[PDB]
Each structure stands twice: as structure tokens, then as C-alpha cells.
Paper text:
pmcMicrotubules (MTs) for m by self-assembly of GTP-bound αβ-tubulin heterodimers into a cylinder consisting of laterally associated linear protofilaments (pfs). During incorporation into the MT lattice, GTP hydrolysis is triggered by the catalytic glutamate in α-tubulin (E254), which becomes juxtaposed to the GTP in β-tubulin at the longitudinal interface between dimers. GTP hydrolysis has a destabilizing effect on the MT structure, and polymerization can only continue in the presence of a GTP-tubulin cap at the growing end of the MT. Here, in order to better understand the GTP conformation of MTs, we used cryo-EM to visualize MTs assembled from recombinant wild-type (wt) and mutant human tubulin in which the catalytic glutamate in α-tubulin was mutated to alanine or asparagine ([name] or E254N, respectively), making them deficient in GTP hydrolysis.
Author numbering:
A (entry chain C), D (entry chain A): 1 to 37, 40 to 42, 47 to 441
B (entry chain I), E (entry chain H): 1 to 429
C (entry chain M): 1 to 131
């Protein structure tokens, strides 16, 4: 009766969707064929039910290159999905926001919108959309920008959360990532009700340090991101001692409308061989969360301020221990709150412990924690992009590709001033008040 | 979906194409007869990119063979891997262009261009969603150079938004296989910079050096050189015909690798390359390949890259590997090599990863490099052009076919403009 | 033709209940005291009249509406006007007709945004249009 | 005791007859040899009964070229039909209304009328005639026009339904379809108690989109039309929660005598592979019906008005959900009713679910819906024909074939003015009145 | 049911008729002896259209052979598939018309026209309900031209409302097989335009070109040309002798393709056509056939259709196919080719589909085109006529048989009126 649909844009979106829906199928005891041989109808959120025992997800997988969609279709999770929401294009945007937003994205936007409206019209208590896309690829950035525009025009007040793959500072896979990132950020700034940044370099570092996997693959990063999303949706999907909804996320984490960019962190992340040797107390895992190494963005929060934080616990969690841990965190030296916010902590508790996927890398634990922080150091990252942008905008590099596909140079300019204005706003929020 | 029409012109183009289709047949598991004898559905799930499925479960290449002398076509037909081609595509002349670019672009090419374009039009109508064209030819002989320039011009005027690949053999710096190759190369490069989205310069001297030093082959036949060229071509295209943890295609590589429309001349490279006996003495891991590429001795272009700057670098991988190791090596090779990369392109490396290794080898890769060093090449040719145009050497041959000195002057001026353009972007800060 | 806008998250541009109620009261010269009374739809129809000359036909709309089917018919007229002017914001008549605060206020705040988007500066008497 | 006979004219008529009578034989459990190894005598409507258990249909298959009739005779359904109602001509009309209405049609019309009278005289409560014919072929158009004249003259007031193959806008098989179409429409406008337009292009699009049959044949279109006809006759042939008769169709769908041209739509149309993954709620199928893509004519209703609609549901259909779905349809934006009709919905309910043909393309469902809508956008289609006609009438093309076969040029003219008058009537109905 | 009498005139007529009856015998599975050796009742359910049931389960063709020299008749009798024809129908002369139209229409033809018409009347009385007649002859020789014109005149005066087909070989533009073919062709076309409901112009040069280029036959014998003509005949008629998802007959094609009574001269085409080796390398799909037809190289008429406009186009199909694909291909080929089709005939394409393929081939088709390009043909002949009538070349030969110069003048004037008529409807808007 509480519905919330997912929209996966780009190849990264599709792979994270594979991971997330595998995790969901394990969580609710659903076979890949859709049958079912601390729990409410918990699955009614993500899984719509047919006449028989078959359950199908409420998600849309869209990508202009049919490769990953064919892999999903021919994969193990074949019978599960309804064949319509596996939408393919013909040619990829090829890391071109122009191609993914003006030239090709228009050719299939109507079909995607029609499938979304069919999905929504049969729901009862739809809360919102979980958008999984990257800023690197042209498909992800451009098509997501267009889709958020159209959804905002069509649906008035539904929370629209973005779990984007923010481009890394030094470990970059493309060459034109800054252009696409600036364009998509400037476009989605006025539709993204809350956007959660996550970076590849930090997750690589976490995997090498904690999971002890010297050579991790994207499967592992998708597993961690899926765990984050499951922790976020646990309150909706399960009984909890202290429930929290999506509107609560959108309200407690966004002090100003333009500054809506929290970052995520998960704990504990320890291997089965290291599953023992420590009891994983709530204070211990919270200390691990607030440690700058376990964060999933290449930014040091100790050089900024914390406007807000939201901690979600799941499992056998004792609330007084939660209070003691929070107080101890507040007392420490590396956590100074901003002047205008004397209370920046939200707490949610769920009884359902995290679900361990067979063949995975993590270990089955009894308590788990997701940390969502809206802090100030993230603004520093923006500066880097701006600098990069300006460098590649000094010589008009790669501009012709966008120009010849329905883009204006003034759009690049206005994106640049909008990013500079966002940085100025972040800096102004950073300072303290008089008196 | 995303079908590619492959054209080969000249004897060089014909031979590299024969080897290329051999390599593709091995990759997709196809008999000489054209039947499927593979063992994994992955080989057939994207067979349509290069192969048209005729009746009775048979697959034919989507290739066009063009020449002006029947010897090459007869050689292709007679040998193995010859029955799979469609005979109507066997378009050939009778006299040969005689190593003259004018006859290959104006006189003789005009007698077969119409038929070639009708075949191209039929194939384009038959395919589902055309991706682009790739041409294999050379700039030394008259036939390949002139006919390829004419075909590229006509096709791009028939299809503006499609992309066109040209894999042109550039004459060696030390020795010259022909005598009047300056004029032919100048006019061909003029046409290419006019109407091509990218080009891969390939040099015979560099291939000989690679075969002798790295491969330890004391008797390198042309078959081996064509095999390396075909392996490079297949490594470039592999991101489209098979799944991967990070999929790419020709369009992504073109967009990432071309910051300015004129600058679309690249160098290819392949890895790993080991001698017959020296194969088991080395572990095939990601850093080994990465350190094997970024060096002069593994570049198929006759120009030391360290004389200039790296503008962009595309790297395609094949085989099950961890992406983090790939990314770490890319970051390290960029960081320790800050001097040779352009500063005003931060993160000037494109990375693509497939999942299917190339026929035996546990994993391999492919290197495309957009660097300014190739400008030296152009200058050398330009100088030779002047050395042969100040005194009007062999000029009357091309004058007797109706083309006048003004095309020579315009082509020389445009090439010099390209050289200065490379120099300016090399000196940018 | 008419331009269209949206409303996702903006500060210092969200007006209070009483302020918008005074705005509608002053722009149509009447005495609504509850914003959910805008479920009638007559105010929206006269607003469309004032935004574009003609573009509607007020004879069909029933300013004395007091039942649900009357609300539905008025919203059908409003939807026809929206289609005629090319504004493509689908309106949730099903939630509006029940007359509850949430969707009524949402629709009126979006409509205030759209009204500010497409108003010129003309003056007239709302009564003559109303009768 | 409630009888209604069928008349199939032209090759299209005969093929849709094959499909419809296959569907009927399956519905009532009739072997092709006429034996019987939510049900009342349900079969007494279409099937007359002999002394033994053999049942024979009350239908007339008439066609001037003996090819299709020979195929029916030598086909599987050989023993079923009474050999008299398989009436053949000798030469085909060859897309010539004149040949099918004045020269050749007269030579066998008396036999057809005699057989129809023989069928009628042994009935008890005959409601009417279901005429299946095309406007393209000369046989269909001309012979149907003549037969409608003779039946109207002979039988005073019995409902006469026409399920015609309206010529498509761009996908045509003939060249002289405009002349035949205007002539037959002008002729039958005074006899067709209700004519239901259906177009080939739209059914092709439906089959490609929904059935996922990349290469459908006429068999599938005939199956769909047979399903429509069976849904129409379900109320007569079966028990229902809310029954509806043919006179009800003729009354609720015809506001003005000259405007009697509804269009048909069927739902759901989904394959067995896609039979799962959605529950096919009544609201869902009704939304699919009112979607402009699922309509079977290339005319988009969103640029016109809905004068009337008649929806027939069959299967396990709960009436409150019907009411809720209809209300939601009425609330939407793409359905604007005409001023003079404040109530344009008729609803019928039948308990018998639709019957699946073995070897068919659809999937066995539990609920089914037929939408029969008299709207205004259909008038647009007429305009197209008119334009074509005038073009073909600009240079007097193909006129000699009609002139030298017993036709006057004044007939073509008067058909043209009558058709223009029909368009003007449609337009004046479309507009709104004062006060 | 719907029986057709086939008449053959001239050596060309007899040869094409013999090969045509061979093709029909293969289609219906009949021995040269005339017995039935097929395996499907579909072959026999409509055997009566061309074959008459003699006693003892024997089938004889409903064909009449006419000539003035015994050589052709002896050749037909002696060879295989010759015992099937019923002997009295072998009506022949002794001297031959000597390539003179007057002797074939006035002097010699008058001595056998009565016997031919007695046979025709007997056959018409014996048939159930006659459909129409089809004539296979040529306009070059005197015998075929004159005798066919006379027969068509007398028959159409004996049967007004029946339909009559003529498959007339029109002289080639480049070379002329005879010398005085202008007069013969002019008079024959005059008679045809008076008393024929349609005609299929066929040209030897076009057939040679198709055989050499498309069929890749370096040594095309006349048998192959007659094979293509007979295949065209069978493809045209197949809609009547077998069931189909959309049945047609001769009358439907005549009504659809003839907008004006004079304009009834068409061009035939066949598909698919492939070389011996190039057959398996191609998938035979509906769009492949559609793109094979709409081009000059597959038209049996010696005139490029793109010089003029398409008035109407009839397309007959054979083989199990999806009708929507047929319809989509027709719509696409009309939409992308809006320029060459007449505007004031919207949707100017007739489509017919049968169910029986024509042997070895799983599906095939047949093309009939009513276009104005053929007018060029007429003008050429007209010019030659003037070039040979201004100086009275060979005129005394036809003057010595009783024909008058006035008759030549009326024939030329009527042909020029026809040319202007085509020109006017080509310029209509
Ligand atoms: N963490 C993580 N990032 C991924 C994964 N897959 C793709 N990415 C990111 O996606 C970027 C590549 O561009 P994409 O967004 O995937 O491009 P696309 O969606 O294929 O669309 P095109 O650019 O048109 O091909 C890389 O920079 C990665 O950071 C994944 O599995 N895990
Ligand atoms: N890599 C490689 N290059 C080759 C090979 N064979 C020939 N070439 C190059 O191709 C050039 C041959 O000239 P072509 O372009 O083929 O000239 P052509 O097509 O024969 O036309 P004509 O010169 O008129 O006879 C030489 O300059 C060689 O450098 C080969 O086997 N491998
Ligand atoms: N949807 C559909 N349409 C058909 C079918 N069969 C024939 N038609 C239509 O019929 C038209 C052909 O003309 P017909 O009415 O069949 O002509 P006829 O009944 O054979 O009579 P003649 O014209 O004298 O041959 C085509 O345009 C088709 O649209 C069918 O099975 N399904
Ligand atoms: N397509 C085709 N045409 C042929 C063939 N044989 C002859 N012709 C044509 O037929 C013409 C022969 O003249 P005919 O009409 O047969 O003259 P005839 O019947 O022999 O009478 P006379 O000329 O008096 O001897 C030539 O112009 C050829 O173009 C053939 O085998 N195939
Ligand atoms: Mg992509
Ligand atoms: Mg050569
Ligand atoms: Mg018929
Ligand atoms: Mg002779």
C-alpha cells in the first residue's frame, strides 16, 4: 500500500539495478522466477502482485545501448521482470549530454513516460522515485536531466532521490566527464529533491582496506550501493522501533533548497574471516562511520562543517546505546557543527537486520548502519570540476560535438555561472553569523 | 543493430581485409563455408554487426572488395576463407590505376564508383540501424588512395551524420616503396581531413621494427603485419560486439578522442606481444600491458611520441579483469607521465572494458593515441612534396588527366595549416 | 500560444495561505475565506478568462455549483481551456473534487506560478464576465 | 429462440467468417462435424438444430470468385455448413462497384434473397443481420449495397449491423478504392442501421506492438475481429449480470440518423509470454481501451469529441470496479464530451469469459472488454477519401469502367455532394450551441 | 471455371508459347504425355483454366498454334513436351509471310483466319464461362504481327466484353533484327490500340542486358529469354489458378492498371533473379524483392522508367508471406519515391498475393508497370517511320498487296496522338 518506483538510467544504473533487485529478491524470499515458496505485505512496496504468486518489480531499466539490457534479459533474472520496462535504444549517447538530451533522448522519452504513468496509475500510496544514474556517461546525464524535467512537469510533489556516480577527482574513465557533469547538475538543480553523491575512488579504497579484496570489480561497488539503498528503504519495507519516510529524508537533510547534496556511508564492512575478533558495538560502527576514511566521496569532512546528519540503524539495536554513541560522537574534536544548526542528528531504527547475499563479499552481521550527511566539504569537490571545466573551456575543446547536436554555447556559459553561484552559496552557508 | 559496412581498397586494403575477416571468423566461430560451429550463444547474440544472415543458417560478411587489377581478387577467391564472400561485392577493374592518384580518383575510379555506391546503398537499405563505415586502404598506391578518397567523399555526402573510419598505411620515413607517393599522400590526407571523423596512421617501418624486436621474428612476412593490423582493428571494435563491464563503441571513442574536428589522426598499438618461446616467462596482468603500451617501441606509427605531447589516449581491454586495477594503472601512468600529456585536458584518458578475450590469450588490449608527434610525419611529407613540386617532377602525368596545379597548391596549403594547428595546440597552456 | 512552468523546490517564492487567498479575492473581487473552496473551479475559469481573451465560454461553467458532478463539469471546461492554450500540465481532478486542503493548495500554488508566467497587465471588470 | 443471422460478402467477409465460426464452434463446444460430445440453449442463436445432434450455422457466404468458397468447402469445416449457403459466382467484380451492383450482382441476388428468406422463415424471434464486408473490393461494396437495398425493401425494421474494412489512409492494396468506397457509403447510408468502422493499418500496428508478432497475417486480424463480434453477441448468447441487445446498440450509439459510424476497440491483447506480470484489472484494461493507440482506426479521438460509448465486459467482472474505472476515465483530460451529451457511457456485463482458440496468438484471460465508440474524429478520415476522390475525379480516371457497365456520371457526382453533406453534418454536430 | 484460350502467332509466339506451356506443366505437375503425376489436390482443383479433360484422365492444353511456315510447327512437334498438344490446333501455312505485314494481315492471313476462328469458336463453345484471351506474338516479323492483329480484330468483334492480352516483342532500340520493322510495328500498334485491353511491351535488348548483368550468363540462349517471359506470364496468371490471401485475376489488374482506354501498354518484371552461385548468399525477403523490382535494370522494356512518371503499378506475390510486410514495403517504396508517381492518383499500387510458390523458389513475384516512359519508344519508332516514309522506302511492297498510303498515314497519326496523350497525362497536375 506504500509504493515507490525505481528508474535506472545508464549502464551504471542498470548494473546497480541488477545488484539492488538481487538484494531485494533475497530480502523478501523471492525466487528469480517470481514465486515465494519483522515482516508485515512488506514486498508490496517494490513488488506488484499478479493473480498467481508471481511478483514483478516496479522499476524501469532504460539505456540507449542494448548491451546491458540484453545481458539482463538473458541473465538469471529473466522471468522476473515485465518485458516492457526493459527499454532499449539503438545508439548510445557516447558521453555527450547533447546527444542524450536533445537528439536521441527525445526519440524514446514518450515510451518511458507512458510506462511510468502505467506503473503509477495502479499504485495507491506512491511516495516517489529512486533514480540511479551516473554523471559520466552521456546517456545517464542527459536522459536523466530530461526525465527529471518531464516528471517534475507531470508529477507535482513526489520526492525524487538521485544516487549519482559523481566523477572522481583523479581516477576518471572518460575525457568529457566535466562538461556532462556541469550540464546535468545545472539541469537537475531545480528538480532533484535530494541527491546523494557517491564516488568510485572512495569505494575502491574502502574495498581494498576493509574487504581485503586486492582486485575488486564493479559487482562489489554495486553490492555496497544496493546495501545503502536497502538500508534507506528498510523503514518503509519493514517494522521498526522508530520509522522514517522519504519526506523525512527530504526535510531533515535539506536546510536550503539549492544545497541538497548529502553523501553516504555504510558500516560495518568486514569480511567473514574478520567477522569475528570484534563485537561490532553501535558505538564502534558509529565511530567507523564518522571516520573520514569510510566515507564514499573523496572529500575530507574535517575541513568543513556538518549541516545535518541522518543515521539509520537496523538489527538488534538498543536505543540507549544509540543515545550514548551519539553523545560521544558529538563530544569529539573532528565533528564541529555549523553555527545556525544546534541539532543536526536524525535517528531511525529498524528491527530487520541486513541480508547477506550468497557469493558476496560482506559478512552476516547483527547490526548495520547507514550514514547520510549533508556537510560543507563536498563544495570543495565542485571547485575541482569548475577548474577542470575552465581549463577545457579555455581552448573550446570538444565543443563542436555539442554544438552540432542542438546545443548553444550560452548553455555552457550559464551552466558555468550557475555552478559558480552554487559554490558562492555553499561558502556563504559555511560561515557563521554575527551576534 | 549497429551494423557496420567494411570497405577495403587497393591491394593492401584487400590483404588486410582478408586477414581481418579471418580474425573475425575465428572470434565468432564461423567456418570457411559460413556455418556456425561456435559453442557459446555470446558469439551469435551480436553476429549481425558484421555478418548478414542469409537463408539456411548461413552468415556472409558485410564487406565490399574494390580494386582495379584482378590479381588481388583472384588471390582472395582462390585461397581459403574465400567462399564466404558474396560474389557481387567482388568489384574490380581491369587495367589498374598504375600507382597514379588521378586515375584512381578521376579517370578509372569514375568507371566503378557508381557500382560501388549502388552496392553500398543496397547494403545500407538492408541493414537495421547503420552505425558507420570503416575503410582499409593505403596512401602510397594510386588505386587505394584515390578510390578510397572518392568513396569516402561520395558516401559522406550520401550520409552526413554517420561516422567513417579509415585505416591508411602511411609511407615509411626511411625507405619509400614507390616514387611519387608525396603527391598521392598529400591529396589523400587533404581528402581525409576534409571528410573523415578519424584515421589511424599505420607505418610499415614501425611494423617491421615491432616484428623484429618484440616478436623476435627474423623473417616477418606480410601476413604477420596484416595479422597485427587486424588484431588492432578487432580490439578497437570489440567493445560493440560483446558485453563488458564498461561498454563503448566507435562513437564514444570518436567523441572522447577528437577535441577539434580537423585533428582526427591517431596511432594504434596492441598488447600483449611476446615471442614464441618468451610467452610463459611473463604473467599477463594489467600493469604489464599498461607498461607495454606507453613506449615508443610498441607504437605502429613512425614517430617517437616523446618528441611531442599526448592530447588524448583511448585504451580498450578484453578479458575478465578487476576494474580498480585498471583505473589505478591508468592514474599511475598519467601521474608519472605528467610532462607528455596536455595540461588543459585533465583526465585525458578514455577507458573501455569488454569481457571476451581474443582467441587463446587470457586477456589483451588495444591502444589508440591522439598525439601531436605525427605532425613530424606531415612536415616530412610536405617537405618532400615541395622537393618534388618546385621542379614539377612527374607533374605532367597528373596534368594529363585534367587536374591542374591548383589542387596541389590547395592541398599543400591545407596540410601546412593542419601542421601549424597541431603545433599551436601543442604549445597551448 | 502560452508558456508553462513547474514548481519543485524554491525558497522566498512560496506564498502563504492568507496571502494567496487575498490575491484571488482581489483579482476576482469576491470573499472566499477557505482556500479549498477553490474546488469549485469557477475561480480558475475566470482566471483563464482574464489571462487570455475569449479562450473559454463562461456560459457552461456554473458559478452556483454545490455538488460533485458540477465540480467535475467545471474541471472538464478547465481541461478543455488548458488543451486549447497548449499548457500541458495534467490536473488531478479526482483529488481536487473532494475539496481537501492538500491538492487544492498544491494546484493553486502551481496556478499562481503559471499565472505570474502568463500575465500582461490588462484591466477589466470581473463582474461583467461573471454576469 | 433468439436468432440473428450472418451475411459475409466478399473475400474479406468469407475469411472473417471462417475466423468467427471457428470461434463460435469453440465457444459452444461444437466439433467441426457439428456434434456436441454460464450456459443456458445458448447455441440456438447462431446454430440451428437438426433431428440428430448435428448443428448448422445460420450464415450466408456469398462471393463471385469461387476460390475462397472452394477453400471453405475443402477445408476442415467441410461437413458443418449446409451446402446451399456457400454461394459462388463465376467472375469477380474486380474492384468495380458497377460490376458488383448492376451487371453481375443481379444475376445471383435472387438466390441469395431466397436463401435468406428460407433461413428467416424457420426462425422465431429474429433480431437482425450481421453483415461482414469490405469497401475495397467491388464484390463486397457493390453486392453489399444491393443486398442492403433488397433487405430493407423486404424486411421493414430489423437491425442491420455492418462491420466493414474501411480503406486505410496510406496502406492500400487497390487503386480504385476511393470510388468504390464513396459509392458504397452513399448507397448504404440509408440502410445501415449501424456501421462499425475498422482499419487494417491500426490492426497491423496493434499486432506488432502488443502481440509481439513481428510478421502477422490476415489470420490474426480475422481473429481479433471475431473476438470483437463474439464480445458483441455474448449478451445474447450467454447469461450476464447486465444484458444488452442489438436494438440497445442501435439506440445508445446513434444520436442522429445520418451519423451512425462507431469504431471498435478490444482489450486486453497480450501474448502468453506477457500473460503474466500484470493482473489485468478492469481499470487497467479500460485505460488501455481509451488509449488512442489501441483503437482499430487511424483516427486519433483527442482532436474530436465523444458523442457516445458502449463498453461490454465479460468474465469475472465486479461492477463497483466498473463504476470506479468509468469515473476515473471521465475525470481524465483526453476525453472531452460533446455539449449535448452529458452521459455518454453504456455498460454491459457478461459472466462468460472470452474463449481462446488453440493455435491462436492471444492468451487466456479472465476479463475482457470491447469498446464501441461513436466519436467525431472519424469525420477527419472521410475528408481524406474525399480529397483522394476529387484528385482521381480531376482527370476522369478509371471512369470508363463504370460508365460502360451500367453507371451514370451523375451517380458519382451525387455521391460526392452527399458525402460532402455528411462531412458538414459531422462538423455541425461537432460544434457547441449557444446558452 | 474461368477458362483462357492461349494463341501463339509467329516463330517467336510459338517458341514462347512452348516454353510457357512447359512452365505451366511443371506448375501443375503434368507429364509430356499429359497424365497427372502431381502430389497435391491444389494442382488439380483448377486444372480446367488452361487444360481440357479428354477421356482416360488426360489433360490437353487449351492452346492454338498459328504460323505460315512449317519449320516452327515441326520443331514443336518433334521435341519433348510435344505430344500434349491436340493435333488439329497446329494450324500453319506453307510459304511464310516473308516478313511483310500486308501478307500477314491481308493476303496470306486471309487463307487461314477462317480455320483459326472455327477452332476458336469450337473452344469457346466447349468452355464453361470464358474469361479472356492472351496472345503471344511479336511486332517485328510480318507473320506474327499481321496475323495477330487480324485475329485480335476478328475475335474482339466476335466477343466484345471479353478481355484480351497480348505479349508483343517490341524491336530493340540499338539494333534492328529486321529492316522494315517500322511499318509493321506502326500498323500492329495501331491495331492493338484499337482492339486490346492491355499489352506487355517486351524488348530483346532489355532481356539480353538482364541475362548478362543480373543472371551472369555470358552465353544467353533464346531459351533463357523465353524462360523469363514464360515466368512473367505464369506470375501474372497465378492469382487465378490457385488460392491466395488476396485473390486477383486478369480483370482486376486490367481495371486497376488502365485509367484511360487507350493507355494500356505496360512493362513486365520478374523477381528474384540471381546467378547460379550467388543464390544462397542472399535472404529472399519481401523488401529484397521490392527493391529488386523498382529499378531500371530489372525492367524488360528498353526505356529507363525514371525518364517519365509511374501511372500505376501492379505487384503479384507468390509464397507464404506476411501481408503487412508486403503492405509496409509498398508504402515505403511509394513514400520515398513520391517524385516518379503521379500525384492525382493517390495510392497508385495494386497488390495481389497467391499461396503457391513457383518451384525450387520458396517465394517470388511479378511486376506490371503502367508508366509513360514507354512513350519514348513510340516516338523513336515514329521518327524511323517518317525517316522511311518520307522517301517511300519499301512502300511498293505493301502497295502491291492492296494496302494504301492513307492507311499508313492514319496509323502514324493515331500513334502520334497516343504519344501526345501520354505526354499530356505525364504533365497533368
Ligand atoms: N561504481 C560504479 N560505476 C559505474 C559502473 N558502471 C558504470 N559506472 C560509471 O559510469 C561511467 C561510464 O559512463 P556511463 O554512465 O556508464 O555511460 P553509459 O550509461 O553506458 O551511456 P553512454 O555514455 O552513451 O555509453 C564510468 O565513469 C563509471 O564511473 C558500476 O558498475 N559501478
Ligand atoms: N602492412 C602491409 N602493407 C602492405 C602490404 N602489401 C602492400 N602494402 C603497402 O601497400 C602499398 C601498395 O600500393 P597499393 O596502395 O596497394 O597500390 P595498388 O592498389 O596496387 O594500385 P597500383 O599502385 O596502381 O598498382 C605499398 O606501398 C606497401 O607499403 C602488406 O602486406 N602489409
Ligand atoms: N483485415 C482484413 N482485410 C481483408 C482480408 N481479406 C481481404 N481484406 C480486404 O479486402 C480488400 C480486397 O478487396 P476484396 O473486398 O477482398 O475484393 P473481393 O471480395 O475479392 O472481390 P473482388 O474485388 O471482385 O475480387 C483489401 O483491401 C483488404 O483490406 C482479411 O483477411 N483481413
Ligand atoms: N524473346 C525472344 N524473341 C525472339 C526469339 N526468336 C525470335 N524472336 C523475335 O522474333 C522476331 C522474329 O520475327 P517473327 O515475328 O517470328 O517473323 P516470322 O513469324 O518468322 O514471319 P516471317 O518474318 O515472315 O518469316 C525477331 O525480330 C526477334 O526479335 C526468341 O527466341 N526469344
Ligand atoms: Mg551507454
Ligand atoms: Mg594496384
Ligand atoms: Mg473478389
Ligand atoms: Mg516466319
Amino acid at each position: 500500500m506504500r509504493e515507490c518506483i525505481s528508474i535506472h538510467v545508464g549502464q551504471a544504473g542498470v548494473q546497480i539495478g541488477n545488484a539492488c533487485w538481487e538484494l531485494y529478491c533475497l530480502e523478501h524470499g523471492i525466487q528469480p522466477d517470481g514465486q515465494m515458496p519483522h515482516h508485515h505485505d512488506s514486498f508490496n512496496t517494490f513488488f506488484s502482485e499478479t493473480g498467481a504468486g508471481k511478483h514483478v518489480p516496479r522499476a524501469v531499466f532504460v539505456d540507449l545501448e542494448p548491451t546491458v539490457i540484453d545481458e539482463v534479459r538473458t541473465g538469471t533474472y529473466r522471468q522476473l521482470f515485465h518485458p516492457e520496462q526493459l527499454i532499449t535504444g539503438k545508439e548510445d549517447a557516447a558521453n555527450n549530454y547533447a546527444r542524450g538530451h536533445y537528439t536521441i533522448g527525445k526519440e524514446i522519452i514518450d515510451l518511458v513516460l507512458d510506462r511510468i504513468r502505467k506503473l503509477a496509475d495502479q499504485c495507491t500510496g506512491l511516495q516517489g522515485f529512486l533514480v540511479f544514474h551516473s554523471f559520466g556517461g552521456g546517456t545517464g546525464s542527459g536522459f536523466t536531466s530530461l526525465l527529471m524535467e518531464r516528471l517534475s512537469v507531470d508529477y507535482g510533489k513526489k520526492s525524487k532521490l538521485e544516487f549519482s556516480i559523481y566523477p572522481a577527482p583523479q581516477v576518471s574513465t572518460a575525457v568529457v566527464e566535466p562538461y556532462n557533469s556541469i550540464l546535468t547538475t545545472h539541469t537537475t538543480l531545480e528538480h532533484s529533491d535530494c541527491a546523494f553523491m557517491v564516488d568510485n575512488e572512495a569505494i575502491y579504497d574502502i574495498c581494498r582496506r576493509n574487504l581485503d579484496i586486492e582486485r575488486p570489480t564493479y559487482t562489489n561497488l554495486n553490492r555496497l550501493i544496493s546495501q545503502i539503498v536497502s538500508s534507506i528503504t528498510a523503514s518503509l519495507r519493514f517494522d521498526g522501533a522508530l520509522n522514517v519516510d522519504l519526506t523525512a529524508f527530504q526535510t531533515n537533510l535539506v536546510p536550503y533548497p539549492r544545497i541538497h547534496f548529502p553523501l553516504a556511508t555504510y558500516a560495518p564492512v568486514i569480511s567473514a574471516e574478520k567477522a569475528y575478533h570484534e563485537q561490532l558495538s553501535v558505538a564502534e560502527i558509529t565511530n567507523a562511520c564518522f571516520e573520514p576514511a569510510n566515507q564514499m566521496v573523496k572529500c575530507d569532512p574535517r575541513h568543513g562543517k556538518y549541516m545535518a546528519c541522518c543515521l539509520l540503524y537496523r538489527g538488534d539495536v538498543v536505543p540507549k546505546d544509540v543515545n550514548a554513541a551519539i553523545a560521544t560522537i558529538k563530544t569529539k574534536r573532528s565533528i564541529q557543527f555549523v553555527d545556525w544548526c544546534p541539532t543536526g542528528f536524525k535517528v531511525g531504527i529498524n528491527y530487520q537486520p541486513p541480508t547477506v547475499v550468497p557469493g558476496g563479499d560482506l559478512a552476516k552481521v547483527q547490526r548495520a548502519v547507514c550514514m547520510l550527511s549533508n556537510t560543507t566539504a563536498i563544495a570543495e569537490a565542485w571547485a575541482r570540476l569548475d577548474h577542470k571545466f575552465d581549463l577545457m573551456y579555455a581552448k573550446r575543446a570538444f565543443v563542436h560535438w555539442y554544438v552540432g547536436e542542438g546545443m548553444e554555447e550560452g548553455e555552457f556559459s550559464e551552466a558555468r555561472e550557475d555552478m559558480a553561484a552554487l559554490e558562492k552559496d555553499y561558502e556563504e552557508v559555511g560561515v557563521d553569523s554575527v551576534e | 543493430m549497429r551494423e557496420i559496412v567494411h570497405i577495403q581498397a587497393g591491394q593492401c586494403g584487400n590483404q588486410i581485409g582478408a586477414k581481418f575477416w579471418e580474425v573475425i571468423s575465428d572470434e565468432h566461430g564461423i567456418d570457411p563455408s559460413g556455418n556456425y560451429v561456435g559453442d557459446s550463444d555470446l558469439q551469435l547474440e551480436r553476429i549481425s554487426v558484421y555478418y548478414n544472415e542469409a537463408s539456411s543458417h548461413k552468415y556472409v560478411p558485410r564487406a565490399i572488395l574494390v580494386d582495379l587489377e584482378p590479381g588481388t581478387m583472384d588471390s582472395v577467391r582462390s585461397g581459403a576463407f574465400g567462399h564466404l564472400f558474396r560474389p557481387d561485392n567482388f568489384i574490380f577493374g581491369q587495367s589498374g590505376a598504375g600507382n597514379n592518384w588521378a586515375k584512381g580518383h578521376y579517370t578509372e575510379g569514375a568507371e566503378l564508383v557508381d557500382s560501388v555506391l549502388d552496392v553500398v546503398r543496397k547494403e545500407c537499405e538492408n541493414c537495421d540501424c547503420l552505425q558507420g563505415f570503416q575503410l582499409t586502404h593505403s596512401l602510397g598506391g594510386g588505386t587505394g588512395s584515390g578510390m578510397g578518397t572518392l568513396l569516402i567523399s561520395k558516401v559522406r555526402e550520401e550520409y552526413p551524420d554517420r561516422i567513417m573510419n579509415t585505416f591508411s598505411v602511411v609511407p615509411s620515413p626511411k625507405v619509400s616503396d614507390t616514387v611519387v607517393e608525396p603527391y598521392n599522400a598529400t591529396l589523400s590526407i587533404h581528402q581525409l581531413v576534409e571528410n573523415t571523423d578519424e584515421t589511424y596512421c599505420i607505418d610499415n617501418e614501425a611494423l617491421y621494427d615491432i616484428c623484429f624486436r618484440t616478436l623476435k621474428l627474423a623473417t616477418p612476412t606480410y601476413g604477420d603485419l596484416n595479422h597485427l593490423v587486424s588484431a588492432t582493428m578487432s580490439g578497437v571494435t570489440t567493445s560493440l560486439r560483446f558485453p563488458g563491464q564498461l561498454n563503448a563503441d566507435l562513437r564514444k571513442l570518436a567523441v572522447n578522442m577528437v577535441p577539434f574536428p580537423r585533428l582526427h589522426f591517431f596511432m594504434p598499438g596492441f598488447a600483449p606481444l611476446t615471442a614464441r618461446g618468451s610467452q610463459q616467462y611473463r604473467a599477463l596482468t594489467v600493469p604489464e600491458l599498461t607498461q607495454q603500451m606507453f613506449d615508443a617501441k610498441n607504437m605502429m606509427a613512425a614517430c617517437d611520441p616523446r618528441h611531442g605531447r599526448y592530447l588524448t589516449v583511448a585504451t580498450v581491454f578484453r578479458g575478465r579483469m578487476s576494474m580498480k586495477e585498471v583505473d589505478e594503472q591508468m592514474l599511475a601512468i598519467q601521474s608519472k607521465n605528467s610532462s607528455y600529456f596536455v595540461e588543459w585536458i585533465p583526465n585525458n584518458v578514455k577507458v573501455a572494458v569488454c569481457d571476451i578475450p581474443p582467441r587463446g590469450l587470457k586477456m589483451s588490449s588495444t591502444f589508440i593515441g591522439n598525439s601531436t608527434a605525427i605532425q613530424e610525419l606531415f612536415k616530412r611529407i610536405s617537405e618532400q612534396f615541395t622537393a618534388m613540386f618546385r621542379r614539377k617532377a612527374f607533374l605532367h602525368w597528373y596534368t594529363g588527366e585534367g587536374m591542374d596545379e591548383m589542387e596541389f597548391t590547395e592541398a599543400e596549403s591545407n596540410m601546412n595549416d593542419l601542421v601549424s594547428e597541431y603545433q599551436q595546440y601543442q604549445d597551448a597552456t | 500560444m502560452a508558456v508553462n512552468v513547474y514548481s519543485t523546490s524554491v525558497t522566498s517564492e512560496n506564498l502563504s495561505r492568507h496571502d494567496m487567498l487575498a490575491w484571488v479575492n482581489d483579482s476576482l473581487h469576491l470573499n472566499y475565506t477557505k482556500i479549498e473552496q477553490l474546488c469549485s473551479g469557477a475561480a480558475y475559469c475566470q482566471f483563464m478568462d482574464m489571462l487570455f481573451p475569449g479562450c473559454v465560454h463562461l456560459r457552461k461553467v456554473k458559478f452556483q455549483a454545490k455538488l460533485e458532478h458540477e465540480y467535475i463539469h467545471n474541471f472538464k471546461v478547465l481541461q478543455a481551456a488548458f488543451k486549447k492554450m497548449g499548457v500541458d500540465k495534467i490536473i488531478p481532478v479526482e483529488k481536487l473534487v473532494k475539496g481537501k486542503f492538500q491538492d487544492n493548495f498544491e494546484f493553486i500554488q502551481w496556478f499562481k506560478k503559471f499565472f505570474d508566467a502568463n500575465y500582461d497587465g490588462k484591466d477589466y471588470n470581473p463582474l461583467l464576465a461573471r454576469q
